[PDB]
């Protein structure tokens with residue numbers, strides 16, 4: 001689809017078998033989701049945003065479906081204000097900016 | 100143009116008579132620029148993201164030229180680590196997401 005930006009680009013995602021809402025975020029290198037239980041091993045990591053750095057759980061090679069488009073990649077879980085889909089998965093679904 | 104997301108979507112902008120590099124950020128409601136001395140009146144504001152909040156100065160009706168496309172609207176100024184072009188100006192230059 002073509003998505004205009006007069007509203008937040010929110011989409012439904014499916015991860016770990018559960019549906020959630022997420023923000024398509026071209027300003028995020030990484031995908032960061034709010035606290036949730038995910039299967040598989042994880043490693044502690046740190047990521048920095050506009051307000052400072054937070055600790056996250058890094059899940060590698062996680063299956064995640066974004067508006068019916070499949071992606072498999074790194075998902076960070078931690079105290080983010082909003083579920084964000086970052087460029088590491090936006091590239092996998094073929095997302096581009098156009099003007 | 101069409102911008103892929105393999106790398107950060109940085110473009111050259113013109114504001115207050117200065118050329119800068121800024122992110123085309125669909126995850127940002129409003130535009131936020133690194134510290135700079137703009138003239139005119141402003142209003143204090145706090146904006147939040149990963150890591151917490153920063154204090155910024157809100158200027159209204161600021162002209163920014165993004166890759167030759169003119170846009171005028173709210174520009175926040177504060178200690179952000181990156182210049183961020185948010186949706187309030189992305190819509191004005193005709194920017195869309197596509198996949």
Ligand SMILES: CCC(CC)CN(C[C@@H](O)[C@H](Cc1ccccc1)NC(=O)O[C@H]1CO[C@H]2OCC[C@H]21)S(=O)(=O)c1ccc(CO)cc1
Pocket residue numbers: 025026027028029030031032047048049050051080081082084086124126127128129130131146147148149175180181183185
């Ligand atoms: C509330 C939703 C977003 C935060 C969750 C909003 N952000 C824009 C986002 O694109 C930032 C923009 C950004 C980019 C680099 C450094 C600071 C902020 N990217 C970001 O935080 O990505 C992190 C995950 O991937 C990594 O790679 C970049 C940092 C990490 S934000 O910078 O905090 C922000 C911007 C403008 C406003 C005013 O409307 C309010 C918040």
